[PDB]
Structure formats: C-alpha cells, structure tokens
Amino acid sequence: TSSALKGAIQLGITHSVGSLSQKPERDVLMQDFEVVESIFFPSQGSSSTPGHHHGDFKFKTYAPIAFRYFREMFGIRPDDYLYSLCNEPLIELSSLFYVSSDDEFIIKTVQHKEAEFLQTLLPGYFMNLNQNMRTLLPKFYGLYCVQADGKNIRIVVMNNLLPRAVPMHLKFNLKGSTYKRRASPKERSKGVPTYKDLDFMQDMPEGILLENDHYTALSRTMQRDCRVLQSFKIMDYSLLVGIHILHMGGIPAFNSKGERLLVFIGIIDILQSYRTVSVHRPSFYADRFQKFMCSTVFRK
Amino acid sequence: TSSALKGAIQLGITHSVGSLSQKPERDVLMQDFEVVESIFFPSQGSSSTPGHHHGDFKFKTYAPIAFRYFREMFGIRPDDYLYSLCNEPLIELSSLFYVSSDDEFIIKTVQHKEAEFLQTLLPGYFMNLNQNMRTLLPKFYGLYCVQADGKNIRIVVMNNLLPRAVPMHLKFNLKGSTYKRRASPKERSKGVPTYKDLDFMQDMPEGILLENDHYTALSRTMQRDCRVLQSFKIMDYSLLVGIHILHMGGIPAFNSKGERLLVFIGIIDILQSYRTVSVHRPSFYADRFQKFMCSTVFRK
Numbered sequence: 300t301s302s303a304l305k306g307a308i309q310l311g312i313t314h315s316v317g318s319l320s321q322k323p324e325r326d327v328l329m330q331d332f333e334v335v336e337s338i339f340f341p342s343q344g345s346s347s348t349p350g351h352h353h354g355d356f357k358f359k360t361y362a363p364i365a366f367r368y369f370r371e372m373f374g375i376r377p378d379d380y381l382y383s384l385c386n387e388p389l390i391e392l393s394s395l396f397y398v399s400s401d402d403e404f405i406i407k408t409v410q411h412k413e414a415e416f417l418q419t420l421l422p423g424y425f426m427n428l429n430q431n432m433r434t435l436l437p438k439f440y441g442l443y444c445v446q447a448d449g450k451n452i453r454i455v456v457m458n459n460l461l462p463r464a465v466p467m468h469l470k471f472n473l474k475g476s477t478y479k480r481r482a483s484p485k486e487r488s489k490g491v492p493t494y495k496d497l498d499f500m501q502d503m504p505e506g507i508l509l510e511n512d513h514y515t516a517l518s519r520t521m522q523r524d525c526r527v528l529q530s531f532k533i534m535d536y537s538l539l540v541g542i543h544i545l546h547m548g549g550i551p552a553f554n555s556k557g558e559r560l561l562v563f564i565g566i567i568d569i570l571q572s573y574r575t576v577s578v579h580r581p582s583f584y585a586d587r588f589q590k591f592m593c594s595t596v597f598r599k
Numbered sequence: 600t601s602s603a604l605k606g607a608i609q610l611g612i613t614h615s616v617g618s619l620s621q622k623p624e625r626d627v628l629m630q631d632f633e634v635v636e637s638i639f640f641p642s643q644g645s646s647s648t649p650g651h652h653h654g655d656f657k658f659k660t661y662a663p664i665a666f667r668y669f670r671e672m673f674g675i676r677p678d679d680y681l682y683s684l685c686n687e688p689l690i691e692l693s694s695l696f697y698v699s700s701d702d703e704f705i706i707k708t709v710q711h712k713e714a715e716f717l718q719t720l721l722p723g724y725f726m727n728l729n730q731n732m733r734t735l736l737p738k739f740y741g742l743y744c745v746q747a748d749g750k751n752i753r754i755v756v757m758n759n760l761l762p763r764a765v766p767m768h769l770k771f772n773l774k775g776s777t778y779k780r781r782a783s784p785k786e787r788s789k790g791v792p793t794y795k796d797l798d799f800m801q802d803m804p805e806g807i808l809l810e811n812d813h814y815t816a817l818s819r820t821m822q823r824d825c826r827v828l829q830s831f832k833i834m835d836y837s838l839l840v841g842i843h844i845l846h847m848g849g850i851p852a853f854n855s856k857g858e859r860l861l862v863f864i865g866i867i868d869i870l871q872s873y874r875t876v877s878v879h880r881p882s883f884y885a886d887r888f889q890k891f892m893c894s895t896v897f898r899k
C-alpha cells in the first residue's frame with residue numbers, strides 16, 4: 300500500500316502549512332533550524348485532524364519556519380505548494396521518488412542519516428542561498444517524516460529540474476568519474492535515456508559550446524557550489540543535465556554540429572556526507588567534478 | 600602607555616586587511632566564523648612585519664573572511680577602513696573606547712567572555728543582516744585582540760551612531776528600566792549630556808512624534824531586533840538616541856512644541872548574554888525595552 304503513504308504525505312503537509320499560514324510571519328533564527336514538530340492523525344479522526352482511509356500515523360514537519368522562508372525565497376506561494384502536492388494525485392517512478400500532477404515538485408526519500416544531516420546543513424544552506432543567488436544546489440521546500448506502524452519514511456520535497464513542459468531530447472547524469480558511468484542498457488532502451496559519463500564523452504565528443512558570456516557564469520557559480528559542498532564533506536552528487544534543441548528558463552548553447560540548444564542543469568544527491576574517507580577526499584571529488592563539467596561538458 | 604595600544608591596533612589591522620585584499624574573494628562558509636588568525640610583530644622587525652617603537656606583540660584577527668563580508672555588506676570599502684583607522688591618530692574617550700580621526704569608526708574593548716560570545720553570534724548575525732535590512736544592531740566591522748606581555752586587550756571595531764558631522768542637541772541612552780536611569784550629574788554638566796531614562800520622561804514628556812509612515816518602520820524593525828536579541832539570551836543593551844533640531848541619514852520627527860527634528864538611533868551593548876537569570880527573563884527585557892521605545896519614546 301503505497302497509496303497509504305501518498306495520502307499520509309498529502310494529509311500532513313496540508314495540516315502543517317495550513318496551520319502555519321494562520322500564524323503570523325517572523326524572521327528565521329538559528330533556533331528554528333533544529334525544531335521538529337509532530338501532529339497525529341488517527342484513522343478515527345480528531346478535533347484537530349480529519350479521519351481517513353489510511354491507517355493511523357504521526358506526521359513530522361522538520362524545521363517548519365525555515366522552510367517557509369526557503370519556499371518564499373524560491374517563489375513558492377503557499378497556496379500553490381498545497382494545491383500541487385496535497386490536492387492532486389501523486390505519480391511514482393521506478394531511494395524512492397514521486398512527482399506532483401503538475402510535474403513541478405519532486406519528492407524523494409532519505410535515510411535517517413541523510414535527513415539528520417540535512418538539519419545540520421540548513422545554516423550553511425541559508426548562507427549560500429543568500430550569497431550565491433544563481434546556485435545550482437537542490438531547492439529544498441520541506442523535510443517531512445511519516446511514521447508507519449514501526450517504520451519511518453522520510454521525505455524531502457524539492458524542485459523538478461526536468462519538467463514535462465519542456466521536451467528533453469537528451470538527459471545526462473554526470474559526476475566526473477568513469478567507473479560504471481555508462482547507462483545500464485535496461486535504461487538505455489527508454490526513449491528518454493539518462494546517459495551517464497562515458498555515454499556523454501563519446502556521443503558528444505565536441506561538447507556543448509557556450510558563449511564567452513554564459514560559460515563564465517557556470518564556471519563561476521559551480522566553483523561556488525563545489526566550495527560549499529566540499530566544505531560540508533559531501534560526495535556522490537551528480538550534475539544532472541537535460542538538453543533541448545530548437546527549430547525559457549534554461550541556458551542557451553551551441554551544438555558540435557551547430558544547432559541551437561537550451562540546456563537545463565542542476566546538482567543532485569547532496570546529502571551523503573563524511574563528517575572511512577581521507578581528509579582531502581571530498582575536495583578531490585569537487586575539483587574533479589568541476590574541472591570536468593567546466594572543461595569536457597561545457598566549453599567556450 | 601596607551602600609545603602602545605593605538606599603534607598595535609593600527610599596525611595589525613593594516614597587516615591583516617592588507618594581506619587579505621591580495622587573497623581573492625570567495626563566499627562565507629560556516630567554517631569561516633570560528634577561524635582566528637595570528638600574526639607576530641617583533642620590535643626588531645621581521646620579513647613579514649615592520650619594526651616599530653612599541654613593544655613586541657601578537658595581533659589576532661578573529662573570523663577574518665566573515666568580517667570582510669560584513670564590511671562590504673555595510674559599504675565599507677577596504678581602502679577607507681584602512682586609512683581611517685590605521686593612517687591617522689586615534690582619539691580616546693572617558694569598558695574603554697577610541698574613535699577614528701574621521702569620527703566614522705568607534706573602537707571598544709570587550710571582556711574575553713564577550714568576544715568569545717560574539718564568535719558564536721556570527722551566524723545569527725549573518726541571518727539577521729540578510730533578512731532585516733534596516734536592523735538597528737551594531738555594525739560589526741572586525742574583532743581583534745592585541746596580546747601585551749601577559750595580558751590581552753580585545754577590540755571590536757564598529758560604527759559611530761553619533762558622528763561629529765551632524766550636531767546633536769540631545770543625547771539619550773535608554774533601556775526601558777528606571778533604577779539609576781538618571782544622568783550622573785558629573786555627566787549632566789557636559790554640554791553634550793547623554794541623559795538616561797528618567798531624564799527623558801520629564802524633559803520630553805510629550806515624547807517624539809513620528810509620522811504614521813516612519814513610526815511603523817521602527818515598531819516593526821525593533822520587534823525584529825528584540826526577537827533576535829532575546830533569542831540569543833542577551834541583555835543590558837540600550838537604545839542610544841541623538842536628536843537634531845532644524846531652522847541626511849536619520850529619521851524625521853516632530854517635537855512636543857512642534858519643531859522639526861532628525862532623530863539618530865541605534866542599539867548598543869549587545870554582548871552580555873546568559874546562555875543566575877530566569878528562563879524567561881531576557882524575553883522580559885526585550886518586551887519592556889520595545890513597549891517602552893515604541894510607546895513612551897516614539898509615538899504616532
């Protein structure tokens with residue numbers, strides 16, 4: 300019964316943000332990042348909580364005020380968040396993901412270790428957001444946890460980098476590494492294949508050309524996201540990249556042949572940190588990661 | 600030999616920010632707040648350090664990169680900082696203060712406890728600065744420590760709320776408390792008397808009137824600074840207030856009689872925290888502090 304999770308997500312977020320938009324607004328304080336609040340949904344029902352078809356669950360909203368601030372800094376009006384996520388069926392896919400009917404939000408699960416680490420990331424995330432306004436890291440809208448009979452599933456709601464609205468003719472999941480970085484042929488048979496690194500280097504060996512103008516932003520704001528990531532001892536993150544070819548949100552690019560492109564990029568899987576690996580190893584992953592994307596994958 | 604401190608301040612800041620403006624710029628990370636860097640000035644001299652008339656000292660710059668960011672967010676070009684402070688004599692006054700020849704910077708000493716607490720305040724300070732852009736808290740430009748033979752003097756360089764450039768006809772140091780809040784008559788004989796709270800309530804008993812427009816900013820951004828301060832368990836801070844009467848930086852106000860004013864305000868002495876006092880006591884100081892200034896001291 301996946302349906303028992305979709306509903307518990309949808310029920311609880313409504314109750315969480317619903318009750319918040321009545322409380323009046325205030326600034327975020329360091330105190331707000333470690334708050335975790337819990338509301339209880341009996342199948343019978345309660346004075347606070349409506350009854351439902353699914354079984355009894357507690358719904359846990361992590362760091363609620365801080366994600367209110369993050370959502371607003373991101374443009375996510377509360378009424379839209381709630382409608383998109385809690386008032387329309389959720390599609391699965393095949394860590395475990397979902398999407399909104401809208402295709403604007405992605406949900407993902409996260410190991411207890413990864414959610415706990417997100418909580419510690421918040422202040423540095425706040426700092427990066429408020430310094431590097433064109434950063435590529437995940438746009439985190441909320442951290443939640445549904446408590447089943449004796450298990451916890453932990454969800455982080457975040458932004459969809461590749462929306463149905465723009466048609467993606469190429470997909471890539473890149474890391475700057477080579478080992479097994481080649482699309483499992485099971486995946487290679489989708490019409491929407493998310494090719495990996497070796498796949499890239501042969502299919503697109505003259506690269507993705509960028510103007511002297513826009514290539515500089517990338518090189519600059521990636522050096523920034525990599526300095527942020529290695530600071531926090533993070534690894535195994537990919538630069539996900541969808542390409543679209545022509546005959547408004549993304550980057551404009553020129554093809555090896557010369558067709559005009561619009562490239563859509565973002566850094567994903569940033570919650571595995573190492574705070575046995577070496578002292579200087581996450582720095583190695585960053586320097587590689589960046590010297591790759593900003594030489595092999597995008598050039599001037 | 601106060602002169603031996605003025606010089607050690609001036610020598611070390613030059614060396615600290617001088618060496619920094621050659622290093623290339625990057626974003627602030629949580630890691631940067633706890634850094635403390637030390638450079639050594641022998642009276643003989645060194646390859647790194649010039650010789651001097653004063654005795655040997657180590658100069659300690661606290662959280663250097665974070666204060667570079669704070670200075671820039673505040674408008675303080677590095678060349679100006681350095682000239683003002685390190686390239687012109689420093690005036691004393693009669694905790695121990697100085698000023699720049701310019702009258703734009705104030706220096707103050709801080710107990711080891713207070714400096715150590717500033718270091719912990721940095722991330723919440725970063726958060727407040729980047730949320731409440733019209734906040735009243737001290738503008739901190741740097742935290743430094745000069746190590747004498749066996750003693751340490753710890754300085755925080757910050758902004759002068761009452762500059763010689765505007766003539767102040769009134770001064771006040773207000774807290775929302777009454778006990779001994781009445782200017783020591785020793786001070787009461789200066790031509791520039793910094794009256795306290797009881798002094799205010801009788802000399803200006805019809806208050807400082809403010810437009811419905813500007814009175815709202817104050818009430819709003821003070822409720823914000825007080826929510827920040829009590830969060831950090833801080834007390835004994837005063838709202839310092841200088842008044843100027845007419846016949847461009849400050850607030851415009853109307854007098855009980857009706858003359859047109861320009862009021863200059865700021866919150867000072869915020870480094871005494873309590874992280875024996877009650878759980879809810881710093882909150883009491885804030886609610887009082889604010890319900891005072893935004894009823895007795897400024898009205899609509």
Ligand SMILES: Nc1ncnc2c1ncn2[C@@H]1O[C@H](COP(=O)(O)OP(=O)(O)OP(=O)(O)O)[C@@H](O)[C@H]1O
Nearest residue numbers: 394395405457458459460461472493535539567568
């Ligand atoms: N924010 C996002 N926007 C668009 N697509 C995404 C997003 N996050 C994940 N995906 C899709 O899921 C894949 C990456 O999943 P991710 O690596 O984040 O999760 P995971 O289960 O931890 O993966 P891995 O097993 O590689 O560590 C990508 O190849 C991408 O196509």
Ligand SMILES: Nc1ncnc2c1ncn2[C@@H]1O[C@H](COP(=O)(O)OP(=O)(O)OP(=O)(O)O)[C@@H](O)[C@H]1O
Nearest residue numbers: 694695705757758759760761772793835839867868
């Ligand atoms: N940033 C500033 N701008 C202008 N004047 C200031 C500033 N800081 C301090 N002063 C002057 O010094 C006085 C306040 O000193 P402050 O209370 O900050 O230091 P202190 O020695 O800890 O004082 P106290 O003994 O009251 O705790 C004020 O009355 C004011 O006139």
Ligand SMILES: [Ca+2]
Nearest residue numbers: 535536537568
């Ligand atoms: Ca991955």
Ligand SMILES: [Ca+2]
Nearest residue numbers: 394535568571
């Ligand atoms: Ca992972």
Ligand SMILES: [Ca+2]
Nearest residue numbers: 835836837868
């Ligand atoms: Ca004081």
Ligand SMILES: [Ca+2]
Nearest residue numbers: 694835868871
């Ligand atoms: Ca004090």
